[PDB]
Amino acid sequence: QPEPDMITIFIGTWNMGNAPPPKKITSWFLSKGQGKTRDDSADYIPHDIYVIGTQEDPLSEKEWLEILKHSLQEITSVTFKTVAIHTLWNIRIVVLAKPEHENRISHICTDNVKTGIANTLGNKGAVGVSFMFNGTSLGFVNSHLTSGSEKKLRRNQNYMNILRFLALGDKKLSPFNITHRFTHLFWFGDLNYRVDLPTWEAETIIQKIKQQQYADLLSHDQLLTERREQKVFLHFEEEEITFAPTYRFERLTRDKYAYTKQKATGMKYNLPSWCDRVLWKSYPLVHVVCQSYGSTSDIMTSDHSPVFATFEAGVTSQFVSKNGPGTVDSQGQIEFLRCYATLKTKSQTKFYLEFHSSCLESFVKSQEGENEEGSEGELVVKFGETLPKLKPIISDPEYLLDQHILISIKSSDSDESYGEGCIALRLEATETQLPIYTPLTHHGELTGHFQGEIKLQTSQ
Ligand SMILES: C[C@H](O)CNCc1c(Cl)cccc1Cl
């Protein structure tokens, strides 16, 4: 039984509008409806992992698990195993996997973050799951962000609180937030970003949706515009949206958008919007391909339609040599040449680096770099040729070229990270000086850059 080098992952997000689901929700798991949909010929082929995010979910965990498992069994004839289930208020995440994966999945973590203070703390936030799948770390975030067309800034704040405080993955990666802890990170939910057009244009928007002419609406989608201006979800991907806005429908049909202000909406308009989204971020040069992104047409119990996305995701095997794990493989080394960090910080402290990777026995601290002034005001931290030689646990190129080095630049004064990034070892050549680059972020905001050269020695 060979270990996989690819798996397929289903991501579902559905704001259920505090209503039980209908008797059949199989179209969701089959990626059928509007948008980028799955080929009929694949219907019986199970995904390896199904990750279901709900919001405004009125069901018990037990009730929803029974519906999900019975749904997948009907589609696939496979009895899926429950990896994890976590609920915060009415925000839920379920992870189901094929039974053959039970002994490939380990280090299962769950957490939640509650967003807002006093007034604004009570029902919005995120749940998350992480685990190892063989040698690959996978994280999944289901967030219900602040509602309302005029709260895009609040949503961006909710995003930053969730990525700062959601405690998933390897706690030894202390400088790193969830946006660096995983080979593949999927973030989905009712993100609640709106199509930002005048209220008077509601009927015009509806007309455009009936014509399947989304271009003039997506150009006002607050998530696309905020992402384009690097206000939120920096370094995340989203597939092109080719399905109608998933909010706000009249229940029991999909023929009508209910957008007019009502006491029940706090006298707010709900112009048709793409509230319900799936984004991802994978480490550099790892295979990840979106194979569906759409909405169902036949599930109408909520004022939202379910959204599906599916992915091919590269995975690696749990590598064992004669040497590592449990020693170094002297045949292997990672060297850094001519490296420097460019930082946006206005501070003057000394900086050092930390290198973190599961290819190392433990993280490595550099000596301090030498600060200089950039020509446009910047702080440049020069490491020259002073960075340590990293000793990986396994030298085999089939393992080592699949690995990544996380970098944090830390203040010597405070040991606080000013920036985090990631470097792929999937090089064009070994034993060859090659340029490397990563942007550096902190709390998911751009704080600088790290660039230089790498020289990777494998046992080949
Ligand atoms: C590799 C990714 O495609 C980068 N995405 C950046 C981006 C955003 Cl986030 C929004 C609008 C346009 C663009 Cl290029």
Swiss-Prot record:
Tyrosine phosphorylated by the members of the SRC family after exposure to a diverse array of extracellular stimuli such as cytokines, growth factors, antibodies, chemokines, integrin ligands and hypertonic and oxidative stress. Phosphorylated upon IgG receptor FCGR2B-binding. Its main location: cytoplasm. GO terms for biological process: apoptotic process; determination of adult lifespan; immunoglobulin mediated immune response; intracellular signal transduction; negative regulation of B cell proliferation; negative regulation of bone resorption; negative regulation of interleukin-6 production; negative regulation of monocyte differentiation. Keywords: Apoptosis, Cell membrane, Cytoplasm, Cytoskeleton, Hydrolase, Immunity, Lipid metabolism, Membrane, Phosphoprotein, Repeat, SH2 domain, SH3-binding. GO terms for cellular component: cytoplasm; cytoskeleton; cytosol; membrane raft; plasma membrane. One of its GO terms (molecular function) is SH3 domain binding. Specifically expressed in immune and hematopoietic cells. Expressed in bone marrow and blood cells. Levels vary considerably within this compartment. Present in at least 74% of immature CD34+ cells, whereas within the more mature population of CD33+ cells, it is present in only 10% of cells. Present in the majority of T-cells, while it is present in a minority of B-cells (at protein level). It comes from the Eukaryota. It is found in: Cytoplasm; Cell membrane; Membrane raft; Cytoplasm, Cytoskeleton. Interacts with tyrosine phosphorylated form of SHC1. Interacts with tyrosine phosphorylated form of DOK1. Interacts with tyrosine phosphorylated form of DOK3. Interacts with tyrosine phosphorylated form of SLAMF1/CD150. Interacts with PTPN11 in response to IL-3. Interacts with receptor EPOR. Interacts with receptors MS4A2/FCER1B and FCER1G. Interacts with receptors FCGR2B and FCGR3. Interacts with receptor FCGR2A, leading to regulate gene expression during the phagocytic process. Interacts with GRB2. Interacts with PLCG1. Interacts with tyrosine kinases SRC and TEC. Interacts with c-Met/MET. The SH2 domain interacts with tyrosine phosphorylated forms of proteins such as SHC1 or PTPN11/SHP-2. It competes with that of GRB2 for binding to phosphorylated SHC1 to inhibit the Ras pathway. It is also required for tyrosine phosphorylation. The NPXY sequence motif found in many tyrosine-phosphorylated proteins is required for the specific binding of the PID domain. Phosphatidylinositol (PtdIns) phosphatase that specifically hydrolyzes the 5-phosphate of phosphatidylinositol-3,4,5-trisphosphate (PtdIns(3,4,5)P3) to produce PtdIns(3,4)P2, thereby negatively regulating the PI3K (phosphoinositide 3-kinase) pathways. Able also to hydrolyzes the 5-phosphate of phosphatidylinositol-4,5-bisphosphate (PtdIns(4,5)P3) and inositol 1,3,4,5-tetrakisphosphate. Acts as a negative regulator of B-cell antigen receptor signaling. Belongs to the inositol 1,4,5-trisphosphate 5-phosphatase family. This is Phosphatidylinositol 3,4,5-trisphosphate 5-phosphatase 1. It comes from Homo sapiens (Human). The chain holds residues 398 to 857 of 1189 of the full protein.
